[PDB]
Design a protein around this ligand. Structure first.
Ligand code: SAM
Ligand code: SAM
Ligand code: AMP
Ligand code: AMP
Ligand code: CL
Ligand code: CL
Ligand code: CL
Lengths: 442, 442
């Protein structure tokens, strides 16, 4: 009888599915976690076009497992306590059409035995802290990596060191240390455990998909360090830029988080409303919240200029500078400038034409834009002290201009006629050269 | 200069690619491992239809990496010694068309950072024993699992405890303990290290493909325990049965290995030359060697009978027994019998028709086949002491037959007319019942 099986539970941790007579006894009601988990189930089931195979690690009394089988999922629940699995099976038998199996076993051994494709979604709620406590953080990171490797999505509720109990002392400094080796992760909620006032965060993690409520797609590779608060995911015709505003440990000062926030926000604003006369990459999706923000854009051909420079690849500096200057002059005509023209913000296509790819540093108002013209000289010099004729003649001409006349329209016009300009080395000069060489050091 | 870089190597472990003046100095010539690795490169490149991305872990002086880049591979080599990477890079620069990159780094951190699809083939030759020695066997198993998870194939040369040095003591009992958690593995050679007379085995490992020289295909799931010396891999229209004759530890006695060998051999012989009047599954590939044997067959629909029995699924015992008896009678007419008719050797399709799926126990000559008819009664009883009318009447009729008349043609004929046979419970009987009930216990 169910009555007996429930009584023999060491703890009624969860609601007993279909049996509200124990709801008052359950440590956690599970309705809040279930609301969120069913939303994510539906998103992923919609994306894949079918009901999911779900793995429930430390499934306890089966509530999540049965609740998803109720919606058509095929589920396997694992728990190392016989008493818990006895209840899960007795509940499944009351619901014979649910495709639900339960097994006694250890999460560590199950994860080692998993095969990729067997399960689409795994859930691990409030269980990994027990594995941390007995086996340490590094083994848990590897288990969670494998779990992500073999599924399409993982949902974790993770206990945290701020919880007031003795086992909190063995927890990592931040729960994100258990998952940050995985490719994609997002905080999706925080839940009251009824053990204390400290809530547990729930994360959605994937090694195969971008999972954003509006955009759910496989990616084939990703990157953290460009050229660690920013991650880039590459799919067939998209790049998803994912910025963390909220990072663990020291990592971001207040100012840096706000700048992550500012840049991504500014980039979204510009790209959703670009200026006429400028070909901006197209925007497929975007959003922001307290922890992070994201932007999914069309994927552009080419390589990042700084990589080409680092990997000593052959470059046409004329075509790169010409094309970039042309786009900068067109921006300026529409009252836009870019505050940070550097090799890692420039992409060069197969025909050696260049374009900006980060619009975080775009600005709309201001003497000016004289400073930006100055840095652009450094850019030029780093792209190559190092300027042969007629690049040097170009710069010398700019330097002879009154400063109120410095702007990107002028820079471009002089650049186009640089072969006609007088020879800098024939003049006393000589300072423009030394100031940028010191700048280009500085 | 290369001269200087080579001199500064703590050890010239490998041949210096393109520079035979150091071949006499190299600890290992590498030509034997390279012959085998290039063969496996070609097989996998042929299967995938393209040049491969290859990862070389602990790449030392770059010999394998450069030698594969020479054949069109794109390679990344990793080593934690700066001196080694300096030589690798200097060699790559002598061969500018090779797509070869090298990085200083630790194998543990690289594996954690890998993404699935980035590399098709990883090689790890004589390097993991260093990671075992510092981090232990369990962490190395997890690293190797992840390596297999993220690639299509892995080639490992593994040091072994029989090597006479002090670090041998930290090695596992058998090198297969580092890899047996991976889905597919095969010994492909054994190599002289020049440190001692003990050779190191080279394994080909995969978590995604069956990699047999004649048959190279993805699989989507696999299984060890049927219903651990036998593994089954399932692909789109095939099942590959892989039997180990050579197993680690105690696992197989001499007799058991020979029986693995005998069964698989016998199954290959039968299926490649099946008897007329019997629909045998078709054979796609097969082979045997000292360590193991394999058989790739067409994949049959249905479920294994023993699973259906265990998972209490609905079965039609009439249709199952009828169909099986019909095929057993047709075998017998061609002078073939099956020595081991049990639920785990029988597959039942959607229309409840049954067939044998393991032909290891097929035999061709012998009083006989009286023992087999007897077991078939146990089979019958386990499929349900437990026999209602008219199954009991069937068995009673058989038992009244002189023993020289017991055979599967008779069993089938009586089975088809069982509704007409006299009622066993009306007779003294009663023993046939008790002998099989004791047999069915026994
Ligand atoms: C605190 S409860 C969480 C239950 C459930 N996941 C939930 O959040 O509603 C932890 C559960 O995991 C199980 N468990 C703990 N460590 C385990 C392990 N190493 N393998 C399998 N089950 C484990 C316990 O038996 C218990 O049912
Ligand atoms: C015995 S040698 C084998 C070299 C090469 N794989 C071969 O078999 O021809 C081991 C190599 O691995 C490197 N190595 C050892 N442990 C390493 C680690 N943890 N990460 C990166 N490289 C490592 C050593 O620097 C050395 O080059
Ligand atoms: N729209 C895009 N299309 C292609 N690559 C991009 C795009 N946006 C960013 N990247 C790439 O993102 C990587 C590193 O991030 P980032 O700082 O954006 O350059 C570089 O390799 C860029 O080429
Ligand atoms: N030709 C085949 N087609 C489909 N399944 C097979 C075939 N051969 C073996 N199996 C399956 O292999 C699994 C376990 O191995 P076995 O002992 O061969 O039954 C069972 O689930 C069988 O259904
Ligand atoms: Cl946890
Ligand atoms: Cl580990
Ligand atoms: Cl090794």
């Amino acid at each position: 009888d169910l009555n007996t099986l429930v009584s023999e539970l060491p703890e009624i941790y969860q609601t007993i599915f279909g049996h509200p007579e124990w709801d008052g006894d359950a440590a956690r009601d599970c309705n809040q976690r279930l609301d969120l988990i069913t939303e994510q189930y539906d998103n992923l089931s919609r994306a894949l076009g079918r009901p999911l195979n779900v793995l429930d690690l430390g499934c306890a009394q089966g509530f999540f497992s049965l609740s998803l089988a109720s919606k058509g999922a095929t589920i396997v629940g694992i728990d190392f306590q016989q008493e818990n699995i006895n209840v899960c099976r007795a509940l499944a038998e009351e619901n014979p059409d649910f495709a639900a199996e339960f097994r006694v076993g250890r999460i560590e051994e199950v994860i080692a035995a998993l095969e990729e494709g067997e399960f689409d979604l795994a859930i691990g709620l409030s269980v990994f802290h027990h594995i941390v406590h007995l086996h340490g953080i590094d083994e848990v990171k590897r288990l969670l990596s494998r779990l992500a490797d073999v599924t399409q999505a993982v949902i974790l509720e993770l206990a945290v060191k701020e919880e007031p109990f003795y086992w909190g002392v063995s927890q990592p400094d931040d729960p994100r240390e258990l998952i940050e080796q995985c490719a994609f992760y997002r905080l999706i909620g925080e839940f009251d455990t009824h053990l204390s006032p400290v809530p547990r965060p729930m994360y959605l993690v994937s090694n195969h998909r971008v999972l954003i409520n509006d955009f759910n797609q496989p990616f084939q590779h990703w990157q953290n360090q460009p050229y660690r608060s920013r991650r880039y995911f590459f799919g067939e015709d998209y790049v998803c830029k994912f910025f963390y505003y909220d990072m663990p440990h020291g990592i971001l000062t207040a100012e840096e988080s706000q700048r992550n926030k500012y840049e991504l926000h500014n980039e979204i604003k510009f790209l959703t409303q670009p200026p006429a006369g400028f070909d901006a990459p197209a925007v497929l999706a975007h959003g922001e919240n307290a922890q992070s923000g994201w932007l999914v854009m069309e994927k552009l051909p080419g390589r990042l200029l700084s990589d080409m420079l680092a990997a000593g690849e052959e470059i046409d500096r004329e075509k790169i500078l010409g094309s970039l200057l042309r786009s900068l002059a067109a921006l300026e005509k529409q009252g836009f400038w870019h505050d940070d023209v550097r090799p890692w913000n420039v992409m060069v296509d197969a025909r050696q034409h260049a374009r900006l790819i980060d619009f975080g540093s775009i600005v709309t108002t201001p003497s000016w834009p004289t400073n930006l013209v100055q840095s652009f000289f450094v850019f030029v010099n780093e792209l190559f002290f190092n300027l042969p004729q007629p690049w040097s003649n170009w710069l010398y001409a700019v330097w002879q201009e009154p400063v109120e006349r410095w702007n990107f329209v002028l820079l471009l016009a002089l650049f186009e006629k640089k072969a006609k300009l007088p020879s800098a080395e024939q003049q006393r000069g000589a300072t423009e050269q030394w100031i940028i060489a010191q700048e280009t050091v500085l």
